[PDB]
């Protein structure tokens, strides 16, 4: 993972405009709706039977907060992502056994959410910077697989 | 395999593309080439610079093929037969690239048509794009 001015700075710019609490719930909710097999990892979260149910679920909303909080922290260590996520990699790979393709799907869902709310402002060059980040994050989470 | 509700979601959402076909197809391509530079290796003689007329032309052709697929969503293998031979036989397009273009199309629809990008329609469009990709990566 390596960025540049208007890339490292462009990511930081748009993220300062994101409510870290709420964006996590939207991105996780959409992951569970668009890729329903991921619901298997969260059966204890209650009603995930409907799109409306998913997005209103307080456990999804709450767990999204934590997911994106770690993502936000990843933005403060863009040059040391494998180290920042080393323990979470152990949890997801060694205990939960989440297939790493799901890490890629969640980053791309987050990118779709950012595009939804920002419209034209989420330009191809801005998306390109964010694609670098979510690929770096997905890779660091999969590190205990490599 | 698309459900009846998926077909309803995609027709309603994509039918709102309308006169933006070329622009949306071009932007999805520009997004893909920028976010995933390896995809440019399939267009070795194209002018791929920002705003390229050649990319606009190809973007309309890609967007027009999706309109056709939506109109014939119950018979995609027949309606996409020529394109399937082009991509699978002629071009030997690695399947991973269809996932990149599909993602950039979703991003383009989400940025331009927010009202159409509800979670449920998001899910249907993704499946539709995956079904198209499965067909275009097939040899029959």
């Amino acid at each position, epitope marked *: 993972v390596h960025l540049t001015p208007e890339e490292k700075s462009a990511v930081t710019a748009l993220w300062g405009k*994101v409510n870290v609490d709420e964006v996590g719930g939207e991105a996780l909710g959409r992951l569970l709706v668009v890729y329903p097999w991921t619901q298997r990892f969260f059966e204890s979260f209650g009603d995930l039977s409907t799109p*409306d149910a998913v997005m*209103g679920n307080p456990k999804v909303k709450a767990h999204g907060k934590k997911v994106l909080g770690a993502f936000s922290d990843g933005l403060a260590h863009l040059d040391n992502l494998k180290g920042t996520f080393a323990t979470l990699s152990e949890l997801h790979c060694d205990k939960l056994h989440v297939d790493p393709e799901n890490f890629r799907l969640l980053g791309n869902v987050l990118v779709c959410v950012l595009a939804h709310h920002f419209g034209k*402002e989420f330009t191809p060059p801005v998306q390109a910077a964010y694609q670098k980040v979510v690929a770096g994050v997905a890779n660091a989470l999969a590190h205990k697989y490599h | 395999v698309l459900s009846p509700a998926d077909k309803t979601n995609v027709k309603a959402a994509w039918g709102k593309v309308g006169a933006h076909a070329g622009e949306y197809g071009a932007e999805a391509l520009e997004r893909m080439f920028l976010s995933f530079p390896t995809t440019k290796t399939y267009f070795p003689h194209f002018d791929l610079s920002h705003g390229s007329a050649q990319v606009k032309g190809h973007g309309k052709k890609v967007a027009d093929a999706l309109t056709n697929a939506v109109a014939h969503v119950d018979d995609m293998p027949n309606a996409l037969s020529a394109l399937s031979d082009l991509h699978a036989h002629k071009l030997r397009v690695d399947p991973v690239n269809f996932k990149l273009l599909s993602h950039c199309l979703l991003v383009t629809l989400a940025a331009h048509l927010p009202a159409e990008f509800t979670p449920a329609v998001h899910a249907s469009l993704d499946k539709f794009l995956a079904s198209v990709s499965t067909v275009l990566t097939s040899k029959y």
Partner: nanobody
Amino acid sequence: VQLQESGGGLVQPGGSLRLSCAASGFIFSTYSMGWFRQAPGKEREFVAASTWGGVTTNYADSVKGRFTISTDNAKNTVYLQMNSLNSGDTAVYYCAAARFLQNARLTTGPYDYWGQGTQVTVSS
């Protein structure tokens, strides 16, 4: 088809307030919720808004750090927390809704539905 605003009233300079807007008649999850205000003799004038659900924030610079937005998706209600109010904040604050209004465009975006507005008057 109702936008009922609550909160606001009279406050002392330096004080704070929480405004709320009760929404009805639409699928709340699909509307961008925004807050406008117009001071007496002054034009109608943007304060703060959020993308649907509060995922991203964008406030006029005169209110940034000062006002903060809400989401209560279960109650179809959004709230505006106003801190460090100054008797220069006096105006009628209007709740407004626009279906799928994207960020940055909240300041210059056609709205579909408007409430009564609620008086917020700061003075000593």
